[PDB]
Amino acid sequence: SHMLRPVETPTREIKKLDGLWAFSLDRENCGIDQRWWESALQESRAIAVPGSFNDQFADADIRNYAGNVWYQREVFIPKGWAGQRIVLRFDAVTHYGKVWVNNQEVMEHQGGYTPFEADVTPYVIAGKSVRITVCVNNELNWQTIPPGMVITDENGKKKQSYFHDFFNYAGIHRSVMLYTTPNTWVDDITVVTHVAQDCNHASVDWQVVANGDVSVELRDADQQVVATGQGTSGTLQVVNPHLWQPGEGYLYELCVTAKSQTECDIYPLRVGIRSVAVKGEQFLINHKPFYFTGFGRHEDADLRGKGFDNVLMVHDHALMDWIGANSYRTSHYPYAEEMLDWADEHGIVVIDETAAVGFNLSLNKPKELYSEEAVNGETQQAHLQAIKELIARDKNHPSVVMWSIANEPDTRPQGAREYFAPLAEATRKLDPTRPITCVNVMFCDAHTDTISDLFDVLCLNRYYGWYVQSGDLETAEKVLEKELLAWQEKLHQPIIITEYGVDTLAGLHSMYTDMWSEEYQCAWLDMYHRVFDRVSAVVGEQVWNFADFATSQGILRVGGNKKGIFTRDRKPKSAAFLLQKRWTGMNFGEKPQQGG
Amino acid sequence: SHMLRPVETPTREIKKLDGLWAFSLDRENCGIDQRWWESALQESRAIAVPGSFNDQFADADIRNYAGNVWYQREVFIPKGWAGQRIVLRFDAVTHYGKVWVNNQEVMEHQGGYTPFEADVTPYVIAGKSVRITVCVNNELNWQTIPPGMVITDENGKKKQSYFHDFFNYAGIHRSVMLYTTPNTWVDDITVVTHVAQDCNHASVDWQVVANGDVSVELRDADQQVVATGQGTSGTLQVVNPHLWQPGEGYLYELCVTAKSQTECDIYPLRVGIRSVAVKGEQFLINHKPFYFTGFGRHEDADLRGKGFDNVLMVHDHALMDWIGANSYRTSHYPYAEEMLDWADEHGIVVIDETAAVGFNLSLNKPKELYSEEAVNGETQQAHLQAIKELIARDKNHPSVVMWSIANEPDTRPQGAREYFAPLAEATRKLDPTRPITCVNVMFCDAHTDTISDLFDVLCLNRYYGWYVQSGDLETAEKVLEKELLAWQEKLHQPIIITEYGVDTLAGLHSMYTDMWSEEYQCAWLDMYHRVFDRVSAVVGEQVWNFADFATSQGILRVGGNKKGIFTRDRKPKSAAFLLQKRWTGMNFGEKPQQGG
Ligand SMILES: CO[C@H]1CC[C@H](OC)[C@@H](NC(=O)CN2CCN(Cc3ccc4c(c3)OCO4)CC2)C1
Ligand SMILES: CO[C@H]1CC[C@H](OC)[C@@H](NC(=O)CN2CCN(Cc3ccc4c(c3)OCO4)CC2)C1
C-alpha cells in the first residue's frame, strides 16, 4: 500500500488519542466468536491510548498475559466532513490489530511498528457517534517479525517465548486518528535528492494522485518559491542550495498539489537536500567523511512501556544534545514517526532498523535455524513485507542515512546465506538512495560470518571484557583490535560499532574497578575508545544502551537491562560525563586522530 | 464566570493539546514591549503541552527560572465551524497566562489550577490557520494563591521563594483546546441531590440559558428515562434511585437542552445521587457513617512535573485500588477535572483543596503575617476568588464531599480570625451542599488554634515522632492521643487526619528501627493507627504522601520529599503492604471496630 503522514492544509485529522478507552482481556478466547465489537465491552476498565497495556494496571497476570485483548471507544464525527473521504489510521498496534467500526470489519494488520489506514466513509455518518473496536494480539511465532514461540500447557494457558532481550510490550503504542481528504486526494509521494561537489543540487519526484493533475512547488524556509514543476512524473529542478547538514538540519518544503475538475488537494512535504553513499572505508554524507556518535535506543519508559509520549521525546533529545550524540539507531524496531521528524529538523543522523531481531537459537527447540520448522519461506515473506513497510514510510526522511535489515542473526547455519541474499537484493531495489547493513553478533567473527559481503556498511555488536574475558581489560583490548583488523583486511568496508556497553548498577562504586560498577563502565568504555582510534576503518560508535530498559525475567537481567548510560528515569551514571567529555571534545562529525 | 467542561453532541472540540509548541525564555523581559505575538517566536525550541517546562530540557537554569516564558503554536480551524460559536479554552496555565490569537489579546488569568476560556468567534475564520501565543508567568507574591516572595540580588536577577513544600512547577500543565457551540448554548448547570432514607430521592436543578428554552431529562445507566423536567430552573422531580455509593459510583445522565427559534444545544451531565452531611462526630454519606482511608496526593511526575498524563492517572488509581484507599485529597491545589471524572465513575471520595497553602512564616521577612505588607485585603480577595473558581468548576462532582479553604495556615497572630471568618462564610454561601474545612498545622494545637470552629470538619496534619519527639514512638503515642482527645472535647467535630507520614529512603533497612528506614515508616504508621482506633471522633486517615515528590532545595529535603508510600517511579516501599493489609482488611468504609 501507499503511505503518507497526515497534515492539515485541506486535510483535517481528529486525534482519537484521547486517553481513555475501554479495555478488556479475552482469557477464554470468546471475543471473535461472541462478536464483542457489536456490543459494549463487558467487565471493562479504562486504559490510556497510546501506551502499552502491560504495566498500566500494576498487575502481574496482565503484564505477562499472552493472547487477545480488546479496545473500544466511541467518537463523534466532525460535521463539515460530509461528502469527504474519511480515513482511520493507527500509527501502530503492536503485533496484531483487527478494527471494526460499529459492526463493520474494516482493517487487519500484522506488524507492530508500522501504520495502517483504511477508507471508512461508507460506514460513518457525520454528526453521529460511532463505536470503534480494536482486537489486539501479542502472540509471536516463527512467521512473525520478530519471531517467537507460544506454549500452551495442560491448563490451557498461553505463555510467550521470544529470542530478543527487550520486553514484549504490546497494545496501541502510538497515535490513533480519523483524517479527511478531498475525493481527489494524494495517497503517495516519492522524493530523491541529488547533490554534486558542491555548487548545486537536483531533486527528482514521483507521486500518484486519485483524480489529479499535478503541480509541485519547492518552497524555502521563508515559504518563497525557489523552483516549480509540472506533471505527475519526474521533476528535476536545480538550485544553489542550503544543504541538509548534521549541524543545522536545514529543510525545504515541497508543496505538491492535486487539481480535479471540482476539487483541489494540497500537501506539504518536508525535504532535506543531502546524499548518503559509501566510498571505500569512509561513510560520506554530502561528500564529506562522517563519524557516528550516539546510542542504540529503545522505546521504553517507566509506566507506558513502548507507548509514545511527547514529554519523553523532548527530554531524551535534550540529553543526547547535551552529551554530544550526533546520531542514533532505531534499535530492533521502527520508532515513532515523530522521532524522525525531530531528527530531520535538528539534523540528527539515524540508522533505521527493522523489527527483524531474534534470528538465533544458540543462547523443545528446532535443530536447524533455517528450515521449515523455525525460519522458512513464509518467514522470508513476512520479513520482506516488513522491509517494505518501513521503507514505504521512511523513504522521504532525510535523517535516515542507512537501512538495517536485521539485528544479530546467527549466520553460522547453512541456510543463512540463502535466506539473506534475496532480501539484501530486494532492499536495494526498493531504495537505491541509502546504503543497507546487517548488524553482526559476537560469535560470528571475521572467519565465520557468511553474509557480511552483501551489505555496504559493517555494523558490529561487541562485548569483549564482559561476556568473554570477563573482567580483563588487558586481554579484551588485544582481542578487539585483532578482531577489528581482521574485519578490515577482509571487506575493507566502513565499520560502525553499533553496540558496545556493560551492565552497570547505578550507585555501585568500587575501588577495585570490577564488573557491574560505575568505575568499570567508565574504564571499559575508555578501553574501547582507544581501540577505535587506532583503526582507520572504524567510522562510528554507538553506545549500548541509552537508558536502562525492561526485559523478560532471567538470571542475566537484574530488573531489566542495566547497560544504559542513563537510568530508566533518565538519571546519568558516571559514564555519561565521560561520554560527554569525548563527544563534545571532538570536532563535529570528524574522527579522532590516531592517538589524538 | 460560568464554567462547563466541553462535551460532544452538538459541541465539537479539536484538542490542540497536541504536544509540540514553540518555547522561549524572556530573561530580559522584552516580550511584552516588542510584541512577540506579532511574529513567530525568535530563538525557540520544541516543548510538550501539557507539561511543566522546568524538567523537559534537563537544564538547571530553565528549571529554576523565574519570570516570563512564551508558548506559540499554529492551528487550522475546522471548515464546518463557520457560523458556529468558537471558544479557546485552557484547562490550566499555572499561575499567570495571557493569550493572543494572531495580534488580538483575548485572555488573561491569575490562578494556575483552574481553567479560563474566551469567545474567539469574531477573530477566527474557518478553514484558515491562526497563530496562538501564550505568555506564562510563574512569579508568586503576597497577593497570589499560593503566596510567595521574589528576591532580586545586586545584579537584578530574580529568584522566587515560597513557603510550601512542593516544587513550584509552571507552564501549561493541562488541556488547551478550541470548541464549538450553537449561538444558543448552555452556559451553566447546577444540581443538588436530596435523598430521603434510601427509598427515593429528589434532584434540584438550575441552569443558565445562554439563549434558549430549557428542558431536562434524567437517564440511568440503561439509557432509559426515569424522570423529566421543564423550564429554566427550579425543577425538583422525585426518583426511585440507585444511589451513588463509595466503591460503586452509580451515575445518572442529566440531559440539558436549550432550544432557540432556530438552534438547539445539548449537554450531557453526569449526576450522582448522594447526600453529604456532618452529624456530631460522624461524617455521613447517604445518612450512613463513613471512614476515610487513602492519601494526600500530588500532581507530580518525573519528567512532566505537574503536567497531566492519562497513563499516570490509570496506574495511580490501580495502586490506590490495590492498596485499599477509598479516598484522597487534592493536596494544595485543584487537580485536573479528569481526576474528578474518574472519581465520580469509580465511587472515590475526594476532599477538594484550593491552592491556598503557605499562609505561614514560622517554619528580611515580614514580622506580621496578617498586615498590609504580607497577607492583606487583596490576598483575601484573591483567596475568595480562588474559592469561587474552584467551586464553580467542581460543584457538580458527586466525588467531592468537602471543600478545603486552606492548608496549614498560622492561626496564632491576631488577624487570622479576621481574615478567615469572611472566607468561611462566603464559601458556605457558594455551596451549602458540602461541609467546609481548613487543614490544621501542628503548632496550632487544641489550645492555640483560633479558627477551627468556623468549619464543619476538623482536618489535622500531625507529625509527632518525626519533627518533634524525634524517633521516640512511646512519647509520640502519648502526645498524639492526648492531642486528639483535646480536639474532641473542644469542637466535637468529626476528625480526619489528613497528613501523617515520615521520610523514608527506599532500600534503607535497619535492625534498630530508626528514622529514614523502611522499618521505621511501618512502625510509625502502625503506632498512629493504634491511636486512631482508640479515638471515636476520628473518621479518617490520609497518609502523607502517596509518592515521593519534588521540592525546593534544602537540608530537610533529600532530593525532594520522601514521605511517599511509593517512590516517584511508583515502586512500593515496605509500608505499602502494611497499609494494604489494614485498608483491605477492614469492612469497606467502616471505622475499625476497636478495631480488628
Ligand atoms: C559466556 O558467553 C555467553 C554468556 C551469555 C551471553 O548472552 C547470552 C552470550 N552472548 C553473546 O556473546 C552475544 N549476545 C547476542 C544476543 N544479545 C541480546 C540478549 C541478551 C540477553 C538475553 C537475550 C538476548 O535473551 C535472553 O537473555 C547480547 C549479546 C555469551
Ligand atoms: C519543632 O520542630 C520543627 C522541626 C522542623 C519542622 O519543619 C518542617 C517543623 N514543622 C512543623 O511543626 C509542622 N510542619 C508545617 C509545614 N509542613 C510542610 C513543609 C515541610 C518542610 C519545608 C517546607 C514546608 O518548606 C521548607 O521546608 C511540614 C509540617 C517542626
Question: In the 3-class helix/strand/coil scheme, how is A472-488 assigned residue by residue?
Answer: CHHHHHHHHHHHHHHHH
Please compute Rg for chain B using Cα positions. 24
Greatest Cα pair distance in chain A = 78
Give the C-alpha separation, A294 to B92, whole Å: 37
Q: Given strand A176-181, what is the order of strands in its sheet?
A: A13-15, A176-181, A85-90, A116-119
Closest CA to B279 of B267, B268, B270, B290: B290
Method: X-ray
Q: Which of A291, A286, A346, A274 is nearest to A313 (CA)?
A: A346
- Residue B14 contacts A, CB cutoff 8 Å: yes
**Strand A264-271 to A252-259 pairing:** antiparallel
CA atoms within 13 A on the CB side of A418: 9
Q: B interface mutation test: which of A303, A342, A568 has the most B CBs within 10 A?
A: A303
Residue nearest (by alpha carbon) to ligand 2 atom 5: B467
Q: Which residues of B touch A322 (CB under 8 A)?
A: 58
B460 lines ligand 2 (CB under 6 A): no
Show the beta-strand stretches assigned E in B331-452.
349-353, 400-407, 436-440
**Three-state secondary-structure class, residue A186:** strand
Alpha carbons B331 and B545: distance in angstroms, whole number: 10
Question: Chain B, 484-523: which have a CB under 8 Å from a chain A CB?
Answer: none
What is the Cα–Cα distance from A82 to A65, expressed in whole angstroms? 42
How many CA atoms does the CB half-sphere of B413 hold within 13 Å?
19
C-alpha B124/C-alpha B131 separation (Å) is 10
CB A164 within 8 A of CB A358: yes
8-state DSSP, B98: E
Phi, psi of A474 (to 5 degrees): -65, -50
**Cβ–Cβ under 8 Å, residues A448 and A362:** no
- Indicate the DSSP class of residue B121: G
Instruction: Give B183-275's CATH code, choosing from 3.40.50.300, 1.10.260.40, 1.10.510.10, 2.60.40.10.
Output: 2.60.40.10
Euclidean distance between CA atoms A50 and A88, whole angstroms: 15
Contact A235, A216 (CB under 8 A): yes
| Residue B42 forms contact with A (CB below 8 Å) | no
**Helical spans, DSSP H, in B395-472:** 415-430
**What's the burial of B58, exposed, middle or buried (CB within 10 Å: 0-12/13-18/19+)?**
buried
- Which residue type is seen at B337? E
Query: Checking DSSP bridges between strand A436-440 and strand A457-461, what pairing results, if any?
Result: parallel
Q: Which residues contact B217 (CB under 8 A, 6 or more apart)?
A: B225, B227, B228, B229, B254, B255, B257
Can the peptide bond before residue A146 be classed as cis, meaning omega within 30 degrees of 0?
A: yes
The Å distance, Cα B107 to ligand 1 centre, comes to 58
The ligand that comes nearest to the alpha carbon of residue A551 is 1
Q: Which residues of A touch B570 (CB under 8 A)?
A: 58, 302-303
Residue B3 Cβ < 6 Å to ligand 2: no
Euclidean distance between CA atoms B499 and B404, whole angstroms: 14
Q: What are phi and psi of A224, to 5 degrees?
A: -95, 150
* B276-596 belongs to CATH 3.10.105.10: no
Given a contact cutoff of 8 angstroms between Cβ atoms, the answer to whether B88 and B117 are in contact is yes
Report the distance separating Cα A457 and Cα A532, nearest Å.
Answer: 16
Alpha carbon of B491 to those of B447, B454, B455, B540: distances in Å?
11, 10, 10, 16
A244/A252 Cα distance (integer angstroms): 9
Phi, psi of B578 (to 5 degrees): -65, -45
Shortest CA distance to B93 belongs to which of B105, B110, B106? B110
- Give which of B236, B242, B229, B237 is closest to B273, Cα–Cα: B242
Distance CA B149, CA A490 (A): 69
Beta bridge partners of A286: none
- Domain A1-182, CATH: 2.60.120.260
| Contacting residues of B for A576, CB less than 8 Å apart | none
Distance CA B448, CA A414 (A): 86
Let me know the angle formed at the C-alpha of A277 by A272 and A279, rounded to the nearest 5 degrees.
150
- Tell me if B403 sits within 8 A of B429, measured CB to CB: no
Contacts of A543 (CB under 8 A, 6+ apart): A294, A295, A296, A500, A501, A525, A565, A579
Residues of B noted as catalytic? 408, 499
Residue type, B596: G
How far, in Å, are A507, B228, B533, B540 from residue B245 at the CA level? 48, 23, 24, 17
Q: State how beta strands B176-181 and B201-209 pair.
A: unpaired
Q: After which residues does chain A have a break in its backbone, defined as C to next N over 2.5 Å? A: 363
Distance (angstroms) between ligand 1 centre and the Cα of A551 equals: 13
Do B509 and B569 touch, CB atoms closer than 8 A? no
Residues whose CB is less than 8 angstroms from the CB of residue A39 and which lie 6 or more positions away in sequence, other chains included: none
Looking at the DSSP assignment, which residues form a beta bridge with residue B412?
none
Q: Are A339 and A393 in contact (CB under 8 A)?
A: no
Distances in Å between the Cα of B165 and the Cα atoms of B83, B92, B501, B548, B551 are 49, 21, 14, 12, 6
Q: Is B370 helix (H, G, I), strand (E, B) or coil?
A: strand
Q: Is the CB of A556 under 6 A from ligand 1?
A: yes
Query: Under a CB-based contact definition with an 8 Å cutoff, are residues A352 and A330 in contact?
Result: yes
Chain breaks in chain B (C to N over 2.5 A) after: 363
Residues B524, B462: Cα–Cα separation, whole Å: 12
Q: Could you give the 3-state DSSP secondary structure of residue A436?
A: strand
Distance CA B506, CA B147 (A): 33
Q: Is the dihedral of CA B281, B287, B289, B290 positive or negative?
A: negative
Q: Is the CB–ligand 1 distance for residue A58 below 6 Å?
A: no
User: Which residues face A195 on adjacent strands?
Assistant: A201
What amino acid is encoded at A473 in this protein? Answer: L
Measured between CB atoms, which of B76, B312, B319 is closest to A58? B319
Contacts of A19 (CB under 8 A, 6+ apart): A48, A49, B310, B311, B313, B314
Question: Closest Cα to residue A214, out of A258, A277, A181, A171?
Answer: A258
Nearest residue to B458 via CA among B471, B439, B472, B443: B439
Q: Which of A281, A408, A519, A541 is catalytic?
A: A408
Q: Is the CB of B281 under 6 A from ligand 2?
A: no
Question: Where would I find the beta strands (DSSP E) of B102-232?
Answer: 104-110, 116-119, 129-137, 148-152, 158-162, 171-172, 176-181, 186-195, 201-209, 213-219, 225-230
Cβ–Cβ < 8 Å for B387, B354 = yes
Check CB contact under 8 Å for A318 and B57. yes
B467 is in an annotated binding site: yes
Kindly provide the residue ranges of all beta strands, DSSP E only, lying in B220-340, ordered along the sequence.
225-230, 233-239, 252-259, 264-271, 276-279, 282-285, 288-289, 292-296, 327-329
Which of A11, A314, A317, A340 to probe the B interface (max B CBs under 10 A)?
Answer: A314
Domain boundaries, chain B: 1-182, 183-275, 276-596
Instruction: Give the closest residue to A105 by CA, choosing from A113, A95, A97, A115.
Output: A97
Give CA–CA dist B503/B560, Å, rounded.
10
Q: Is residue A559 within 8 angstroms of chain B, CB to CB?
A: no
Instruction: Locate B121 and state its grid cell.
Output: 468567534
